[PDB]
Structure formats: structure tokens, C-alpha cells
Copies of this chain bind each other. A is one copy, B any other.
Amino acid sequence: KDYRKKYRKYVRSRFQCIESVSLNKRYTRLRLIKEHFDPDDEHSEPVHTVVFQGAAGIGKTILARKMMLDWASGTLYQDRFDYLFYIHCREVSLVTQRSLGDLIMSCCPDPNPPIHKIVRKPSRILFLMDGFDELQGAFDEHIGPLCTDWQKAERGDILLSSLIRKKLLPEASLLITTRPVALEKLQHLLDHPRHVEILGFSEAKRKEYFFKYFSDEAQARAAFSLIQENEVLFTMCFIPLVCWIVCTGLKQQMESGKSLAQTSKTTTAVYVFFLSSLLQPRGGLCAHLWGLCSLAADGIWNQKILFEESDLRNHGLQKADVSAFLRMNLFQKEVDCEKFYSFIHMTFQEFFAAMYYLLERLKLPSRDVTVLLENYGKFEKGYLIFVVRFLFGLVNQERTSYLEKKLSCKISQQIRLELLKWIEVKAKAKKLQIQPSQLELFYCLYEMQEEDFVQRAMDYFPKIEINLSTRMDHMVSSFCIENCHRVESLSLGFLHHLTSSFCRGLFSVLSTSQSLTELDLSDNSLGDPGMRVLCETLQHPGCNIRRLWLGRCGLSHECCFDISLVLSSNQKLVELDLSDNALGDFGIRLLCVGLKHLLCNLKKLWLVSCCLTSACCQDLASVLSTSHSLTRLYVGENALGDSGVAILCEKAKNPQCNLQKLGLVNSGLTSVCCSALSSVLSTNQNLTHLYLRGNTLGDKGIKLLCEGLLHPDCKLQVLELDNCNLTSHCCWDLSTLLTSSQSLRKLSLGNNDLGDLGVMMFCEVLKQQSCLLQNLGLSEMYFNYETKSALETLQEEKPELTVVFEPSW
């Protein structure tokens, strides 16, 4: 326990501060949301691998630093662990250099007790691989297959591959911080992992950070109020990095007397204005920017985050100017372990990477943007998600004084057309390219802030599919849909803001969109309060939404009260889907009130899998009689029995009824309803379709059911009847109906266990020039060899129809 105490004390001094203010002081709690969560037990469960997902600047880099100092005081994991090893991927040089040297280099200059005594018990070491996205070089998916020898690997790729696969040291605890875009590489290597998402700051947390940052509270409230006054900056301060930048810029200009919350349109504006405040006291510089942007170019082109002294002089800098750049945090990143250089944050290097593409040494901007645009997704050059974003933002001539007139409009205008061309290229890309997602493009599109450009750029969006996670994700999407005049089908994806104070802003966009026709909100956890504000927006005049799908939503009975209102007011809804909702007979009782109103004109309606009984049939029958606009009504999967169908059918036998479709799949059925169904078929005269499946229809019921179908003036075109208990003894009646009735088009009898004699009873009746012309479904039916070939030859005899049996898949 000698060196164990020394190592534990050694970590305390190194990580006391982040390279000034105590880390124990300014640190605040982050949203440790467990992706399918106490800071105590990331490793309580026998899962021995944890991965952290977080966007750039969300605080992954220093979350581990707080975790390791918090360990060093014994407050976190004092029992299962007494050794912690920090693996900074930024400093890692993995191109055939490193051995297990990671262990000696971390502890102390060169002691080797732990290299032998500590490696013995594997439950004593975990590895904190910070920033796997910040890996440098070409990381092939598979390098160094055979790797088990302990002390000698000598290959950086082997070390990372083996340690992740837990082959170098079996039973090894891991906790790695990865950017969410990098999970594609992880999925090749992860084996039974645990995924945790890292969010940012809350409104209360933002106020706490400002108090913990501003020493003089007299202006802290004034600065916070100025920050709180802005609506875009405040919601952009969920990322802690932005809070640091706005605080530094305000405090840097505090000696000058300026503010920051005026040019807070997008991410480019706040960083460019920071660079304004980063250079307004300071200032040649563009060449120094050229010296570093090109250094930041090949630093992402060839993946060189760290900067050498020779590289510093290679592009051409001044040590005093570098120190001037150091002293007030341009990059200010000099490693204490050895004399190297780095940028302050990842977005700053990528911000200057886009600066090179707009200034006017390895890839020219105009010609090599196109190869970059197709190199955008390739991990070989890292990920350039922010590279284009700042490039997209910067061309909009941000209102900063000396960030407009030192760059050239000739390239920027050419860039605008190239970016506009690229958006269409990605939009028309049929293949499901994961990295240039529609949401990611909207992030760049929101960064435009140009009204006419986004109008023409987004006009290449016929179908919009959006998944949302954060509050900022709502505003970026809101700015797009508010001026998309060519959108036809739209959808939303929620995974978290469902309160009416948040979804109202986005939902208000839909009501004011003329081109919008379809809304797909299915498979979401949108609750009743969220549903209530949706109906408020739908009542707005001019809402051209026609068809909405609300399947699998968390809707309950009390939501139907609002839906009855929009039907009684809006006449644009034509198709409404409420399948898979836990609304009882009371919900239909409220819903049927709105449908009975003569103002509404609804044609289609889905109530599949809704918790319903025979009681709702009485209420729904009234609508079926008076609602002239109701044509199709798929009410299958419900628990209503034969009693409910009798009530529904007795009102559906009116010759003036408009019910042209009806589905009763898997609903409790017997042979009694066949008599009622027979009566409506001969009297309705326009029941074009009728779907039955999975029922318990009486074996004798078909005899009663066909009694009504044999009536001349019936126009049933499609009949589906599967999984019903049938026997070959009644198969004769099926043949009689098939030959007699000419209205039928396609009839399917799926997996209905009937004798092979009845199948051959159909062979001649089809050969007798019958009236079944479209399809005949007999799938999931097994016959012998001599029976199977008999149906095959009839296919060629009658090419006008297509018999559907299942000898294959």
C-alpha cells in the first residue's frame, strides 16, 4: 500500500485545476441520462464496459477529470478500484509506436513496481479512454488479429483493438467517451457494452454556472439577465462550452464594456463574435490564421491535433505572438508532460478549418471542397460535421466588423453554389447514408440565416423525416418547416419537451404551412397534454393537414374530447388513424359525438387494437348511419363479440348507407353474425370490401354467410377470410359462390386447414370459366407432390388471374 497511496496523492495534485479556478469549485452536475442515473453505480452491474455519448463541448473531456479527482478523495469507488489510468486519445500516437508503455508513463517518470505487481489482478485496473472521436490517423476496422502477449505489442492499433476487445487484459473495466457520430466504429468492436447519453445544462444550472463564474455578483445578475433576455443564446447555453465562451467574452470585454447577446443567431455567430472579442483587443493575423488554419487543415486532413515547434515555424508564426495567442486563450494548450501545442477545443480547430476554405496549403478550397463533400462522412479524415457547419455559417458574412472585409466574395459566391448543389446531391441520395442525415443538413440550413437561400435549397425536400432529442433540436427544425413551401409528407421523432410550453412552437409551424398534407406522429410517447395543444393548433384556419397517423401514441380516453372539437370545426381531415390506443368505450362515446356533427367530413378511420367492447358498438352505429362522409371503418382487433356486430350490422343494412369498407380482423366472431352480415350484404349494395381474419367463424357460418352472397344484387368485390376454423365438408359451398357471383375479384383463404379434396373441387370450377379474376389466396397450406402440380398447370391455363399458394417464401 506504499505506491498505491503515492499514486492516489499524485493524481490529486495533477487534476486539482483544469490546467486556475479549482475544479472542486466551478464543476456542476451534468445530465447523466442512462440510455436504456446516480454517479455512484455506472459499474455496479456485472457489465464491464461503459461508453459515454456526448456532443462536442458537452463536457466529456473534463467529466472524467472530475470523476478521477472525486475518486482520488475516496468518495467514488473506494472498494473495487484503487488504480485509475487516463488514456487521452488526443495525445496518443498509435502508428506503430506504443507498447504497454501507457502504464509506466501515467504513474510516474519511471518506476516499475505497478508494471509487475498491479498487472497480476485484473480487477484492479480500469482505463479512461477519453475522446475516442479524437483518434488520429487511419483507423482500419481490423488490425492485429492475434494479440495476447502481455508486455510487447508495439502497435498502437493492436493496443486499442485488444484493450477494447479485452484481449490484452481479460476482465478489464472500461469507460470511454465517444462522440455520437463515432458509434459506427464502436459497433464493430463493442462486446456487451453499456451506453449512457450525456446532455448539458438546465436553466437553473446555467444560472448556477454564472454565479460560480462571476466573482462580482453585482454584475452577474445583470449579465445573466442580458443572457436570459436572448432567446437563442439562452437555449444554446445548454452546452457548457458555450457558457464558458460567452462568459469569457463578456469578461474579456468587461474591461472594455461590451455585451455578447446580440449576434447570437447561430453557432458561427457566437464563435465569430468571440473571435472578435478574442482579437478586438489584439487585432498579419490572417497570415497567422493562415499559419494555423492550414495547420488545422492538415491537422484534420492528415489528423494532426498536436502541433510541433517545427510545424509552428513551418507555416510561420511568432513566439511572442504565439505567447500573445497563449495568454488570452486562442488555443493556449501546451501539454505539461512535454513541450507540445494544441487547440483549446475541438470546434475551434474545425472553425479555423473552415476559415481556410474561405480565406482564398494542401487542398485548395474551390476544387477540393467537392472531394471534401464526398469525404465528409469518411472516418479516414475524422468527422467533418462542424467543418461544413462553420463553412456554411461563415459565408453568410457575419455582422462582425473585421470578419467580412478581409475575405474574398469571389470564392464565397462559388462556395454558395457548390453548397447549394451539395444539398441537392445529399437530398437526392437514395442510399441511406447515415452521417449526412436530414437533421444534420437542417443544422447547416439553420446556420444559413438567409431567407431566400434556404427557400431554394430546401425545395429539394419532398419527404421530411425528423427525429428530435433536445430543445435546440426543436428550434433548428422549426426554422426549416416555417418556410418549406414544397413539403408533402412530414413526421416527427421524440426520444426525450413534450410540455405545451415547448411543442407549441413547432406545432404552430404546421398550422401555417400550406403545402403540408400528411402528418405522421405515430410511434411516439406524446401524452394527453401534448395531444391537447395539437388540437389547439389544428383548429387554426388554413391548416391543410388531411391525413394524420397517431398509432402507438400514449393517448388515453380524455384526449378524444379535444379530437371531437377539431372534427366539429375543421373540414380538412379526411383520414384519421388511432390504432393501438388504450381508450375505452368512453373514448368512442366522445369521438362519435364529433363524427355525428354534419360539419365534419371524414372518410377513413382506424380503431385497430383499441380497448373496446360491445358497448361502443351502440355508440358507433349511430355515426355509421348519419355520417354521410364515412366510407371505410377498420375496427378490427377489438374485443367486441358477436353481440356488438349485430348492433353494428342492423344499422348498416340500410340501402342508403355509404359504408363501402369494413374490417373486423381478430374480433370475437361466431356463426351468429353471419346472418346479420348476410342481411347487410344483400341490402347495402355498396359494401365493396369486407375483411375477416383470425376469427372463430362458425364452420356452418359460411353456409349462412354465402346465403346472402348468392343474392344477385350484391357487389362484394374483395373478401378475405383466414385463420378461421374450416373443414373440407363445407368447401363445396365455397365453389358454388365462386362460380355464381360475378362481383368477387380476389378471395383469400389463408392457412384454413381444409382437406385436399376441396382444393381439387376448385380446380375444375376455375377451369369452368368462373368469375374469380384477380387473386385466390391459399397460402400456408401444405399438399402432397401429386396435388401440388395440379395447381401449377392451372396457372398457365388462366394468365388473367394469379393463384396465391405458398410452396416457398
A contact face: mostly helix, strand, loop, or mixed: loop
Looking at the complex, which one of B13, B785, B809 makes contact with A338 (CB distance below 8 Å)? Answer: B785
**Interface residues on chain A, size class:** 20 to 34
Please state if A337 and B808 are interface contacts (CB–CB under 8 Å).
Answer: no
**Residue of B whose beta carbon sits closest to that of A782:** B13
Please state if A110 and B808 are interface contacts (CB–CB under 8 Å).
Answer: yes
Chain B CB within 8 A of A111 CB:
yes
Please state if B784 and A753 are interface contacts (CB–CB under 8 Å).
Answer: no
**A337, A339, A782, A807 interface centre (most CB from chain B within 10 Å):** A782
Note all chain B residues with C-beta closer than 8 A to A110: 808
Chain B CB within 8 A of A599 CB:
no
Within 8 A of B (CB), among A92-117: 108-111
Within 8 A of B (CB), among A600-645: none
Please state if A808 and B13 are interface contacts (CB–CB under 8 Å).
Answer: no
Note all chain B residues with C-beta closer than 8 A to A9: 751, 780
A346 to chain B, nearest CB (A): 24
Note all chain B residues with C-beta closer than 8 A to A808: 108-111
Please state if B809 and A111 are interface contacts (CB–CB under 8 Å).
Answer: yes
A192 to chain B, nearest CB (A): 16
Chain B CB within 8 A of A10 CB:
yes
A597 to chain B, nearest CB (A): 43
Measured between alpha carbons, how far is A110 from B780 in the docked complex, in Å? 14
Chain B CB within 8 A of A336 CB:
yes
Question: If the complex has contacts A108-B809, A111-B809, are A336 and B785 also in contact, measured as CB distance less than 8 A?
Answer: yes
Within 8 A of B (CB), among A1-52: 6, 9-10, 12-14
Note all chain B residues with C-beta closer than 8 A to A13: 753, 781-782
Measured between alpha carbons, how far is A214 from B579 in the docked complex, in Å? 55
Interface string of A560-583 (1 = CB under 8 A from B): 000000000000000000000000
Measured between alpha carbons, how far is A762 from B149 in the docked complex, in Å? 48
**Residue of B whose beta carbon sits closest to that of A13:** B782
Please state if A337 and B785 are interface contacts (CB–CB under 8 Å).
Answer: yes
**Residue of B whose beta carbon sits closest to that of A14:** B782
Note all chain B residues with C-beta closer than 8 A to A10: 782
A783 to chain B, nearest CB (A): 9
Note all chain B residues with C-beta closer than 8 A to A337: 785
Note all chain B residues with C-beta closer than 8 A to A809: 108, 111
Please state if B785 and A339 are interface contacts (CB–CB under 8 Å).
Answer: yes
Within 8 A of B (CB), among A539-568: none
**Residue of B whose beta carbon sits closest to that of A3:** B809
Within 8 A of B (CB), among A650-691: none
Note all chain B residues with C-beta closer than 8 A to A12: 753
Please state if A109 and B751 are interface contacts (CB–CB under 8 Å).
Answer: no
Looking at the complex, which one of B780, B784, B807 makes contact with A109 (CB distance below 8 Å)? Answer: B807
Note all chain B residues with C-beta closer than 8 A to A753: 12-13
Interface string of A693-727 (1 = CB under 8 A from B): 00000000000000000000000000000000000
Note all chain B residues with C-beta closer than 8 A to A336: 784-785
Question: How many protomers of this protein does the assembly include?
Answer: 2
Note all chain B residues with C-beta closer than 8 A to A338: 785
**Residue of B whose beta carbon sits closest to that of A807:** B109
Note all chain B residues with C-beta closer than 8 A to A782: 10, 13-14
Measured between alpha carbons, how far is A76 from B12 in the docked complex, in Å? 60
A108 to chain B, nearest CB (A): 7
Note all chain B residues with C-beta closer than 8 A to A14: 782
Within 8 A of B (CB), among A336-359: 336-339
Note all chain B residues with C-beta closer than 8 A to A781: 13
A647 to chain B, nearest CB (A): 33
Note all chain B residues with C-beta closer than 8 A to A807: 109
Looking at the complex, which one of B111, B780, B785 makes contact with A6 (CB distance below 8 Å)? Answer: B780
**Residue of B whose beta carbon sits closest to that of A10:** B782
A787 to chain B, nearest CB (A): 9
Measured between alpha carbons, how far is A809 from B6 in the docked complex, in Å? 12
Measured between alpha carbons, how far is A12 from B751 in the docked complex, in Å? 12
A570 to chain B, nearest CB (A): 41
A196 to chain B, nearest CB (A): 29
**Residue of B whose beta carbon sits closest to that of A753:** B13
A112 to chain B, nearest CB (A): 10
A407 to chain B, nearest CB (A): 37
**Residue of B whose beta carbon sits closest to that of A110:** B808
Within 8 A of B (CB), among A239-296: none
A257 to chain B, nearest CB (A): 32
Measured between alpha carbons, how far is A35 from B12 in the docked complex, in Å? 44
Measured between alpha carbons, how far is A807 from B785 in the docked complex, in Å? 77
Within 8 A of B (CB), among A144-165: none
A623 to chain B, nearest CB (A): 36
Measured between alpha carbons, how far is A529 from B785 in the docked complex, in Å? 60
Interface string of A771-797 (1 = CB under 8 A from B): 000000000111011000000000000
A251 to chain B, nearest CB (A): 23
Note all chain B residues with C-beta closer than 8 A to A6: 780
Note all chain B residues with C-beta closer than 8 A to A784: 336
Measured between alpha carbons, how far is A784 from B16 in the docked complex, in Å? 13
A334 to chain B, nearest CB (A): 9
A684 to chain B, nearest CB (A): 35
A130 to chain B, nearest CB (A): 20
**A12, A111, A784 interface centre (most CB from chain B within 10 Å):** A784
Measured between alpha carbons, how far is A110 from B6 in the docked complex, in Å? 67
Within 8 A of B (CB), among A736-775: 751, 753
Measured between alpha carbons, how far is A809 from B10 in the docked complex, in Å? 14
Note all chain B residues with C-beta closer than 8 A to A108: 808-809
Note all chain B residues with C-beta closer than 8 A to A111: 808-809
Measured between alpha carbons, how far is A9 from B9 in the docked complex, in Å? 69
**Residue of B whose beta carbon sits closest to that of A111:** B809
A725 to chain B, nearest CB (A): 13
A259 to chain B, nearest CB (A): 35
A389 to chain B, nearest CB (A): 36
Measured between alpha carbons, how far is A751 from B780 in the docked complex, in Å? 80
Measured between alpha carbons, how far is A781 from B13 in the docked complex, in Å? 9
Measured between alpha carbons, how far is A224 from B809 in the docked complex, in Å? 51
Interface string of A310-353 (1 = CB under 8 A from B): 00000000000000000000000000111100000000000000
Measured between alpha carbons, how far is A10 from B809 in the docked complex, in Å? 14
Measured between alpha carbons, how far is A612 from B289 in the docked complex, in Å? 70
Within 8 A of B (CB), among A115-172: none
20 of the cross-chain contacts (CB-CB < 8 Å) are A6-B780, A9-B751, A9-B780, A10-B782, A12-B753, A13-B753, A13-B781, A13-B782, A14-B782, A108-B808, A108-B809, A109-B807, A109-B808, A110-B808, A111-B808, A111-B809, A336-B784, A337-B785, A338-B785, A339-B785
- Chain A contact residues, CB within 8 Å of chain B: 6, 9-10, 12-14, 108-111, 336-339, 751, 753, 780-782, 784-785, 807-809
Q: A9-B751, A109-B808 are in contact. List 5 more A-B contacts (CB 8 A).
A: A13-B753, A13-B781, A13-B782, A14-B782, A337-B785
Query: Nearest 3 CB-CB pairs, A to B?
Result: A336-B784, A13-B782, A111-B809
